[PDB]
Amino acid sequence: VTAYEEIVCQVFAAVLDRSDVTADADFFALGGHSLLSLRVVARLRALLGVDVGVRDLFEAPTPAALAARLTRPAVTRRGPDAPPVLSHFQRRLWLIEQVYQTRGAYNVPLAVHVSDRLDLDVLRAAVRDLVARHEVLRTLVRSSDDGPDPVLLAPEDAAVDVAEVQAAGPVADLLAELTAQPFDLATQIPLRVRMITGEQVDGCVLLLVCHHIAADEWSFAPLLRDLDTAYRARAAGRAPDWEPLPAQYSDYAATLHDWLGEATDPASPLRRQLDYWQHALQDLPDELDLPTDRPRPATASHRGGLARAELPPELVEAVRRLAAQHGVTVFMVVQAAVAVLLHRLGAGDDIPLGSPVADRADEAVHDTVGFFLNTLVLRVNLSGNPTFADLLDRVRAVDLEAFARADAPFDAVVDTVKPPRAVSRHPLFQTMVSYQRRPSDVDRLFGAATRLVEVPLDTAKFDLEFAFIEDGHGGAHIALNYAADLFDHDSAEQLVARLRTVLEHACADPCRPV
Numbered sequence: 001v002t003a004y005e006e007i008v009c010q011v012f013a014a015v016l017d018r019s020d021v022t023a024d025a026d027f028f029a030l031g032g033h034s035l036l037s038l039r040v041v042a043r044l045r046a047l048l049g050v051d052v053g054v055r056d057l058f059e060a061p062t063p064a065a066l067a068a069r070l071t072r073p074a075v076t077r078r079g080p081d082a083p084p085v086l087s088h089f090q091r092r093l094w095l096i097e098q099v100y101q102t103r104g105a106y107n108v109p110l111a112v113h114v115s116d117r118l119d120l121d122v123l124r125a126a127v128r129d130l131v132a133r134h135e136v137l138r139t140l141v142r143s144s145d146d147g148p149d150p151v152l153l154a155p156e157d158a159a160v161d162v163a164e165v166q167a168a169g170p171v172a173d174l175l176a177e178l179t180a181q182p183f184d185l186a187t188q189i190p191l192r193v194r195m196i197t198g199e200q201v202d203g204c205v206l207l208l209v210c211h212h213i214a215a216d217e218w219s220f221a222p223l224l225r226d227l228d229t230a231y232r233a234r235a236a237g238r239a240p241d242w243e244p245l246p247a248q249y250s251d252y253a254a255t256l257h258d259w260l261g262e263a264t265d266p267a268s269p270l271r272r273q274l275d276y277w278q279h280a281l282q283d284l285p286d287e288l289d290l291p292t293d294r295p296r297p298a299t300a301s302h303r304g305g306l307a308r309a310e311l312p313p314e315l316v317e318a319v320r321r322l323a324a325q326h327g328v329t330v331f332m333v334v335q336a337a338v339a340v341l342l343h344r345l346g347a348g349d350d351i352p353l354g355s356p357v358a359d360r361a362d363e364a365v366h367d368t369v370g371f372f373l374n375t376l377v378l379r380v381n382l383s384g385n386p387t388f389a390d391l392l393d394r395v396r397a398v399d400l401e402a403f404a405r406a407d408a409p410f411d412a413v414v415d416t417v418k419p420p421r422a423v424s425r426h427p428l429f430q431t432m433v434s435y436q437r438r439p440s441d442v443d444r445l446f447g448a449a450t451r452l453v454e455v456p457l458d459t460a461k462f463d464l465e466f467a468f469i470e471d472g473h474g475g476a477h478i479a480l481n482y483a484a485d486l487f488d489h490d491s492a493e494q495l496v497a498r499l500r501t502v503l504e505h506a507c508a509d510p511c512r513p514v
């Protein structure tokens with residue numbers, strides 16, 4: 001759970017009086033000492049509601065270490081002969097592709113504009129190095145009577161897919177097209193690389209497409225970092241000089257599945273967290289009464305669109321200050337605003353919102369390539385018509401309770417709650433909200449001038465997905481990924497504009513009833 005880390009950083013900043021704090025910043029190096037540690041401890045006790053002492057700050061002086069400390073064995077690397085192991089995340093992502101024709105909805109794109117057209121032969125060499133380094137990028141998933149089995153391809157046997165694509169038409173729609181092309185997870189590695197060139201592009205656009213089975217959005221930064229390292233080494237005619245990974249994805253999965261235990265074991269973390277969710281999701285609505293343009297079709301298509309809401313830097317700043325002043329994360333403010341929006345549209349007082357939560361606290365995977373996002377149902381109650389400030393308190397309590405049981409796999413939660421099912425409706429929630437932060441310092445990759453370009457998706461995973469996305473340097477926008485079966489594009493533009501309006505009012509006056 002990243003939220004503990006963000007709150008610690010928040011406290012460091014207010015106590016040390018700096019706008020300086022990152023996940024790796026040492027409290028004592030930043031000007032903290034034993035006396036000031038009292039104020040960190042006191043504030044964290046009031047915001048997180050757990051026993052913290054100077055003890056923990058001494059042992060774990062960084063926000064990353066402190067957050068992981070006050071919340072299970074460390075990931076251990078297995079032997080060189082170690083067979084691959086699929087995490088329950090990967091098994092669920094494989095299962096999604098069997099239940100539905102997703103049309104590429106579970107591919108994740110990463111697109112980088114480059115001022116120089118890259119060398120396709122060096123690029124292919126660098127991708128091979130990237131795949132050799134990260135086993136998850138060359139792990140196939142084959143079906144069997146049972147379910148899926150991992151198949152780890154040897155580096156020599158991992159046929160990478162790297163190609164140049166000339167752009168006649170515009171590149172942004174071409175990016176969406178390349179992103180949606182399907183992976184056969186049983187025969188192709190879950191990574192595709194395309195270099196878009198053309199008379200209308202200056203340099204090239206480098207497109208990495210992963211299947212989510214091998215990458216979440218936190219994988220963008222190590223993917224670009226490692227690919228940049230391999231590219232520049234191969235351009236110089238040598239293999240990259242790599243510090244080996246502290247852990248492969250299968251190491252993480254084996255450790256996690258061993259600690260999780262079996263659901264029939266009453267002392268297992270799995271059963272204990274499932275029992276929490278069974279009670280926390282009792283009497284859940286099948287779905288929220290949302291204003292759609294078309295009824296829910298019999299078959300889900302995963303066709304989608306993308307509507308953006310721009311946020312003035314003043315608004316971004318006000319939202320950060322509103323979060324800091326109420327002791328919540330920026331995500332929590334966005335989540336509360338989504339709940340108010342659905343509430344005002346007539347969804348009721350019981351608002352379940354799905355949200356991805358990264359399981360990346362262990363230092364061995366904090367910055368590695370893989371899929372670590374569990375999906376949690378964050379159940380927001382809005383009865384009693386409280387203020388926005390009251391709702392921020394409710395949302396913090398709901399989220400911290402939930403984040404303490406973030407390891408129960410979402411598919412096991414569904415199996416435990418047993419909601420009424422329907423293929424055209426995602427179970428337990430149909431609206432997701434998340435907070436995302438794009439990589440910083442990716443401006444000078446591959447010896448050129450580089451910048452990320454966002455890819456307009458033609459797919460959607462739920463009815464609605466709201467993402468508060470920070471670019472790598474202080475900018476932010478809201479992206480609404482909507483199901484095209486249900487919403488016209490103009491309806492989605494209006495929804496995401498209303499979300500911004502709720503945020504404007506909240507920062508202006510959070511003592512206003514919702």
Ligand SMILES: *P(=O)(O)OCC(C)(C)[C@@H](O)C(=O)NCCC(=O)NCCSCCN
Pocket residue numbers: 033034035
């Ligand atoms: P933090 O690590 O920044 O600071 C810890 C301090 C406050 C320095 C703490 O360790 C401390 O005060 N140490 C000094 C303790 C000491 O000297 N005790 C002996 C006093 S002489 C009395 C003999 N009878």
